[PDB]
Structure 1
Amino acid sequence: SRRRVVITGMGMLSPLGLDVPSSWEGILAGRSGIAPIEHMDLSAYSTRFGGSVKGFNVEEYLSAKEARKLDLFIQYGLAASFQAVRDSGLEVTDANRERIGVSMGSGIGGLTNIENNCRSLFEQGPRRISPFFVPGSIINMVSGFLSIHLGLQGPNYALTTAQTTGTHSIGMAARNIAYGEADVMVAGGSEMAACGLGLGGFGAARALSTRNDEPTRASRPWDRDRDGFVLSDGSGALVLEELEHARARGARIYAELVGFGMSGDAFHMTAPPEDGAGAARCMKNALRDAGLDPRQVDYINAHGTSTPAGDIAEIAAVKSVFGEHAHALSMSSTKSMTGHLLGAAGAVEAIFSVLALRDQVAPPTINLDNPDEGCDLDLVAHEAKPRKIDVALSNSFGFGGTNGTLVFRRFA
């Protein structure tokens, strides 16, 4: 019968920092992680900026020998997983290794590595493809490599649900524990899609902000002058743990994961319905799953991508789910500062949602200079807002019309 699930460990790379604390200081201070991209020549691209992980040192985590075999998205996912597991204090043993699994996901996976090997194939021939091309590129190898390094023999898998990946990964890892398939899961996601194919592909769809002359002002969720999302890189990992297992070992508990919702829009490959009907169904699933009155919700970490259609669909969903209480809760998009980490978006934002509960503060939506038509909720414009937060909700929406909601609350 269904067991309770708590957060005992968290880990992160983001455009704001190489761990959770540094990233969170940037969030509360309203700092942008967005800058012109330096790792490649983007002069032929319509977008030349994004949220890069600055100063990442893989040799804090892995031998340069192993690191060389792995796409940056895998390196990013391992760094976050390693932080989270260390932050948990949990020791892996023969007694518990079978009860500890991993679900670290990615939207796109090893596009950089696949691009570079594609260049080798075309310019030179097949004999120049890396022997590590497959194991070093495919999405399941964050889970695989983490399991190999730490000796985790529990459920081992990976989701790929586009910009929903991080939220789905965390939610389904909670269900693993809830239903007794595991007692501990490392769950979240990682993304590094800032290669020619990534920036070019989102560019070809005209989905990206082209504000190249003011990158820190580009991500402006619900602002009338928004012109698409800002592509960002990194990773979020959480240690999910059955409550009694956590209590037994005297774990520090950040918060409890009480609710998880999924829905499909069944609307469009890439566009949300204007009314946010699928997002509404998802949040209602998650709130019923948590046994909550919707009026208990204090803070929503929005998907808030800074696209015209996405941002307004989200307001519509929140107003429909929460009615008059829509005017009392605080909703913000930390994508205003981090940009959009795609498959890792739900993972870092799940961590921001927990830290909102720990510190009792709503992170700001920066750059919200002129809220758009109907964007008249508390969106925590410009500055972090100290306030009572017992229940925090984190929304993700993706291509395919795939929706995820996580519900966290304070644990005493």
Structure 2
Amino acid sequence: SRRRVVITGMGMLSPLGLDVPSSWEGILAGRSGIAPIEHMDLSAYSTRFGGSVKGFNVEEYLSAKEARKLDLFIQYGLAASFQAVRDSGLEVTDANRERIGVSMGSGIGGLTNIENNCRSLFEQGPRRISPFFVPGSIINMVSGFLSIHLGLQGPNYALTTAQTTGTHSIGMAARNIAYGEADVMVAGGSEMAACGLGLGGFGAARALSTRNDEPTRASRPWDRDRDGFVLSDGSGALVLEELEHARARGARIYAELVGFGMSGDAFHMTAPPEDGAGAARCMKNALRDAGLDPRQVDYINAHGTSTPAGDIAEIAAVKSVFGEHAHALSMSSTKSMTGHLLGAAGAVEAIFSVLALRDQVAPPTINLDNPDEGCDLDLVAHEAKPRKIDVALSNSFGFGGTNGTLVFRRFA
């Protein structure tokens, strides 16, 4: 048998705000965090908008000297991790520090730092590359820096599974606790790829909305006028905790993490299969992991990226998995508001799924003005929907055909 895993702490930077309760207020009001990107010449670029983190103050977390050494994606990781640990009330001691680990990941990592260090390498040669370039940019330094600052000696690692990183990080953090390798983990992801290489990289693949005239309307999952996803920045982080350990110290428990699914499409590098067979296997694996029958699911936080092929495959997968229950469950895409935080997408959407359990409300899919062929499920168009939710799914489907599903259940 296996230990049960609860959420005792949550932390976040999104395009909707600098913490969870502000972000969530935005989610439930159907606000967009999408706007033209500032302080950057995007003239030669086909996309000029995204979800930026607005008014982030890194000195709330770090000295100016330590923040200077660290990619924006690491600063966002640390902010969310610190918020989450503080949200948990957890106290690290000599007695427990070896039982507390970190799995914070990122899809794309330190592009902003790689751009600046390239600028210097090409203009001036290697001798202007920063000393802190490697340790200030590599993806495992959110885990590394947080572990050093808080004295965490538990499992210390980072995942990079593109747009599935946050979901994988949280699920495999939960595995560490359930099989007794740790009692507490800080898990999620962070991303800042609304930079030249991010917008250029994804623009070159024509993966991005080019709807520059109405940036708030660009992200329209399942709408017949969608034209690709919206690149967004930020971080999610949860404190996962073994249930007995949480009860003993009198922790506030948001929800129980009951199920983790993984699967590979083994199909295509960027495109899912049309029937979502991989997402369907993953969701089944997640429900079996939880010992739940598909009928018990009430809410799904879709991947719902606003790509033609991606949005339709998720409908196919849900119909397949859930048969005569696929219309009963509510399924929204909060990317309609936040855009796609890539590796951080799963972290922030896990939090939104937890808070849909707390508040008994399905968040909206905004911009779903004209559902496409076959998109006839309860996609919670335009407006939040209060309803009964005992069990919430959060899905993530990534490049390389890598899939992740988390199942959260109400704790009482």
Compute the TM-score of the two structures, normalised by the length of structure 1: 1.00
Separation in 2 of the partners of 1:30 and 1:238?
Answer: 24
CA distance in 2 between counterparts of 1:403 and 1:118 reads 33
SS of residue in 2 equivalent to 1:407: strand
Shift of 1:115: 1.2
Report deviation, 1:338. 0.1
Counterpart-to-counterpart distance in 2, 1:261 and 1:340:
21
Partners of 2:189 and 2:40 lie apart in 1 by 24
Q: CA deviation at 1:116?
A: 0.9
| 1:403 correspondence with 2:390 | no
Deviations 1:144-168 (A, max 9, x none): 0000000000000000000000000
Deviation string 1:275-313 (CA, Å, 9 cap, x unpaired) is 000000000000000000110000000000000000000
The alpha carbon displacement at 1:181 in A equals: 0.2
Q: Deviations over 1:81-127 (max 9, x none)?
A: 00000000000000000000000000010011011101100000100
Gaps of 5+ in 2: none
**Aligned partners of 1:222 and 1:14: how far apart in 2?**
22
**Structure 1 residue ranges (4+ consecutive) displaced by more than 4 angstroms after TM superposition:** none
Q: What secondary structure is seen at the aligned counterpart in 2 of 1:118? A: helix
What SS does the corresponding residue of 1:159 show, helix, strand or coil? Answer: coil
Alignment RMSD, CA only? 0.4
Q: Distance in 2 between matches of 1:43 and 1:122?
A: 22
Tell me how far 1:49 sits from its aligned partner.
0.1
Q: Distance in 2 between matches of 1:128 and 1:357?
A: 50
Partner-residue secondary structure (3-state), 1:189: strand
Task: State how many pairs are aligned.
Answer: 412
CA distance in 2, matches of 1:163, 1:118: 25
Q: What is the distance in 2 between the residues matched to 1:198 and 1:305?
A: 16
Deviation at 1:39, TM superposition (A): 2.9
Q: What percentage of residue pairs aligned between the two structures are identical?
A: 100
Q: CA deviation at 1:195?
A: 1.2
CA distance in structure 1 between the aligned counterparts of 2:24 and 2:76, rounded to whole angstroms: 18
1:316 positional shift: 0.1
- For residues 195 and 368 of structure 1, what CA distance do their matches in structure 2 show? 28
- 1:117 and 2:117 are equivalent in the alignment: yes
Q: Secondary structure at the match of 1:327?
A: coil
1:110-149 to 2 correspondences below 5 Å: 110-149=110-149
- C-alpha displacement of 1:213: 0.6
State the match for 2:386 in structure 1. Answer: 386
Which residue pairs with 1:219 in the alignment? 219
- TM-score in terms of structure 2 length: 1.00
| Helix, strand or coil at the partner of 2:216 | helix
Query: How far apart, CA to CA, are the structure 1 residues paired with 2:115 and 2:86?
Result: 33
CA displacement, residues 8-28 of structure 1 (integer Å, 9 cap, x when unaligned)? 000000000000000000000
* Cα distance in 1 for residues equivalent to 2:39 and 2:370: 33
Return the alpha-carbon distance in structure 1 between the equivalents of residues 387 and 198 of structure 2. 38
The DSSP-based 3-state class of the residue aligned with 1:93 is: coil
In 1, Cα distance between equivalents of 2:99 and 2:305? 36
Alpha-carbon separation, structure 2, partners of 1:336 and 1:68: 33
The superposition leaves residues 231-279 of structure 1 with CA deviations (integer Å, 9 ceiling, x where unpaired) of 0000000000000000110100000000000000000011000000000
Q: State the alpha-carbon separation in 1 of the partners of residues 58 and 196 from structure 2.
A: 23
Cα distance in 2 for partners of 1:26, 1:247 equals 31
Q: Distance in 1 between matches of 2:341 and 2:316?
A: 24
